[PDB]
Design brief:
1 chains, 303 residues, mainly alpha, 2 domains, flat, DNA-binding, transferase, RNA polymerase I, initially transcribing complex, RNA polymerase I-specific transcription initiation factor RRN11
Length: 303
DNA sequence: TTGTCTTCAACTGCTTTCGCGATGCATGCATGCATGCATGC
């Protein structure tokens, strides 16, 4: 009853997405008309926008104005009537289950089986139980079992590493026996930071644009390994090998490295330093409500 | 107008004997991830 961490499937689901986005396109085409293939799905899904430290959202103010009824019954069924037929052609080539699937999604029903629910089979149902027991044991603070789970999981030739916070917290409350925590974190980062589609990202990703998980997690957690102090110039040397260098938040990680080094003219240059990266992190992002707090601290330093 | 030595000044050649010693721009294969197509049961 939880998301699976393996690449969803082969099967039907492609032909279903076919039917879906093909029909979508026929209706939206005739709709702009009246208002006046993996690739068809691709263009289709394509032309569309793809007191505390909140990445504040973009709120409503310069946005738009009001609309007034577009769509009576007699006029919707206009736009519906033709594309449904063109659909009657390749519907003739997809399978019965997907005839009825398209039929119902087109009546506006919504399925009550899931892609997981219907992908039957010895092996996957076993993985499903394995991963469940993982997520359960981790909820239970049963770090030992949990760990056993995780290990037998990743042993299996199907699981992609989308279960890393799995370890990153698991191996984290497991001081016991294994290289851990930062080990995993900076490992993830080093491996998946270069070149060396669906079924993806925010908490996994590749290069050229940003990479939540591994990056920021080791990138603060090492600074927490320096709250273990009271290391830094290392974290800021290899933090100081950008660029993605639009990673503004990592600009704030850098400025944090300088406020922690600051804790004689050396300490000056470290406070000068943090003063610089805070605004080069006015790049944009959006942190630290008043930087005048950071700066009141920097004046407690200036003493 | 015209003779010509007059003058300055545009071209132009060499230099002690031996060994150790190309740049840019278009074409296409390369890599990787995702749909399609062919073999088999």
């Amino acid at each position: 009853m939880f998301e699976v961490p393996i690449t969803l499937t082969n099967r039907k689901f492609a032909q279903r997405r076919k039917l879906k986005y093909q029909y979508i396109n026929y209706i939206s085409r005739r709709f702009d008309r009246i208002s006046k293939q993996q690739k068809k799905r691709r263009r289709e899904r394509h032309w569309r926008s793809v007191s505390f430290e909140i990445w504040r959202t973009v709120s409503s103010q310069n946005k738009q104005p009001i609309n007034k009824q577009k769509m009576t019954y007699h006029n919707f069924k206009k736009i519906e009537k033709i594309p449904l037929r063109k659909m009657e052609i390749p519907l003739l080539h997809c399978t019965k289950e997907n005839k009825l699937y398209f039929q119902s999604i087109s009546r506006g029903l919504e399925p009550l089986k899931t892609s997981t629910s219907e992908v039957r089979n010895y092996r996957t149902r076993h993985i499903v139980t394995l991963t469940d027991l993982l997520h359960l044991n981790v909820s239970r603070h049963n770090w030992s079992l949990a760990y056993k789970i995780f290990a037998t999981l990743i042993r299996i030739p199907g699981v992609q590493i989308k279960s890393l916070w799995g370890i990153g917290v698991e191996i984290l409350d497991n001081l016991s026996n294994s290289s851990s925590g930062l080990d995993f974190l900076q490992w993830m980062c080093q491996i998946y930071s270069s070149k060396s589609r669906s079924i993806v990202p925010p908490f996994q990703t590749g290069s050229r644009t940003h990479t939540a998980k591994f990056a920021i997690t080791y990138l603060w957690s090492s600074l927490i390994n320096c709250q273990k102090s009271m290391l830094i110039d290392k974290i800021s040397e290899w933090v100081l090998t950008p660029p993605f260098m639009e990673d503004a938040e990592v600009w704030f990680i850098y400025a944090s490295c300088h406020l922690l080094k600051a804790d004689i003219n050396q300490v000056i240059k470290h406070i000068h330093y943090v003063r610089t990266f805070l605004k080069i992190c006015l790049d944009k992002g959006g942190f630290a409500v008043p930087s005048r707090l950071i700066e009141n601290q920097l004046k407690s330093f200036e003493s």
